[PDB]
Ligand binder design. Structure first.
Ligand SMILES: [Zn+2]
Lengths: 167, 201
């Protein structure tokens, strides 16, 4: 609509779990941003809705995606004034840390990417990438990774813990 | 009813063919039909509704391969008890003409379905031929139906069950094995939602 709001976005804030699941399974873009840069994950977090967050994460949510307005991540949008804050924040915090560690360090590209530099790695949406070096202190925004034998740096915000739903 | 003298394995085993499972959700828009929870490894489904289970393999097993499904109680103390339909459901008029009235698990959409009451273990199971995925598909989908509610007195009576899926050759020898918990209920979406909330505690 005029506000960048999609069908998925509306179901989330209204806590209409049945519609959300249907849309996700149908291949609804779990990362579509509204006028303010809010993705479905950002809305779910602001409602502290852990169940929805999980469904989104498990279906290709960009954990490190940031909003246009305050440049915050979903984790940072959790509302400590509403119930369920602790549970949701904890889940998202654990989700962030599990990336490049769980599932044998494997993460899923959520977007096509053309390297800008030879020391960077190029990849297509949906491909599985192994994170070799996560916690490099000198670069909090990139990971050393491997795809089809090739090693290079990749942007953290281009990955999900799970892959997108293809239609 | 006689108790089994043994308990089938629920050990995950990908085998030489890299056999694993995948799941779908059947929910018709607002109506939450059958939903799977990755975090819980648990399927929530409605009685007699389509329950898609996906077979994923790394490479193709030989022709004549078969796929078997069997339910067991999840709790150690109930494991020897054969999972079967309650008196009410066993007697109700919901036959498809192929499945034994006592069997919990049916397969829909396959006229080569075969059912077994094991003479030795007493366990019920259902088996179909393995078919490779359709063109443009990455997996083989089997449509299961569960014919009794978790809450049925005289049946499961609120005791959790696991479904064990095995891949076998034409002779019955094991090729791969996987399993998942199952709750058959009236509102699978709500129950899944609720159980994940409680786990986070
Ligand atoms: Zn029953």
């Amino acid at each position: 609509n005029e506000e960048g709001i999609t069908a998925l976005h509306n179901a989330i804030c209204g806590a209409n779990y049945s519609i959300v699941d249907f849309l996700i399974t149908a291949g609804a873009n779990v990362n579509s941003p509204d006028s303010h840069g809010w993705t479905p994950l950002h809305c779910a977090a602001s409602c502290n809705d852990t169940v929805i967050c999980m469904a989104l994460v498990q279906h290709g949510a960009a954990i490190f995606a940031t909003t246009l307005s305050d440049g915050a991540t979903a984790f940072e949008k959790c509302d400590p004034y509403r119930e369920g804050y602790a549970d949701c924040a904890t889940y998202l915090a654990d989700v962030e840390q599990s990336m490049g560690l769980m599932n044998s360090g494997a993460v899923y590209a959520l977007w096509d990417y053309s390297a800008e530099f030879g020391d960077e790695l190029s990849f297509r949406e949906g491909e599985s990438v192994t994170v070799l070096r996560r916690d490099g202190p000198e670069e909090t925004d990139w990971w050393w990774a491997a795809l089809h034998g090739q090693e290079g740096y990749v942007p953290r915000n281009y990955f999900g813990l799970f892959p997108r739903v293809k239609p | 009813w006689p108790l089994s003298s043994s308990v089938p394995s629920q050990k995950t085993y990908q085998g030489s063919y890299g056999f694993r499972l995948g799941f779908l959700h059947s929910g018709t828009a607002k109506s939450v039909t059958c939903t799977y929870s990755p975090a819980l490894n648990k399927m929530f489904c409605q009685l007699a509704k389509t329950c898609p289970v996906q077979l994923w393999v790394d490479s193709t097993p030989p022709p004549g391969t078969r796929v078997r499904a069997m339910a067991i109680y999840k709790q150690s103390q109930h494991m020897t008890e054969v999972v079967r339909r309650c008196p009410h459901h066993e007697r109700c008029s919901d036959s498809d003409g192929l499945a034994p009235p006592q069997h919990l698990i049916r397969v829909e959409g396959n006229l080569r379905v075969e059912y077994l009451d094991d003479r030795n273990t007493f366990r019920h199971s259902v088996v179909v031929p393995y078919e490779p995925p359709e063109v443009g598909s990455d997996c083989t989908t089997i449509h299961y139906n569960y014919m009794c509610n978790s809450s049925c007195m005289g049946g499961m009576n609120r005791r959790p069950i696991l479904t064990i899926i095995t891949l076998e050759d034409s002779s019955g020898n094991l090729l791969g094995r996987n399993s998942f918990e199952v709750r058959v209920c009236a509102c699978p979406g709500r129950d899944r939602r609720t159980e994940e909330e409680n786990l986070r505690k």
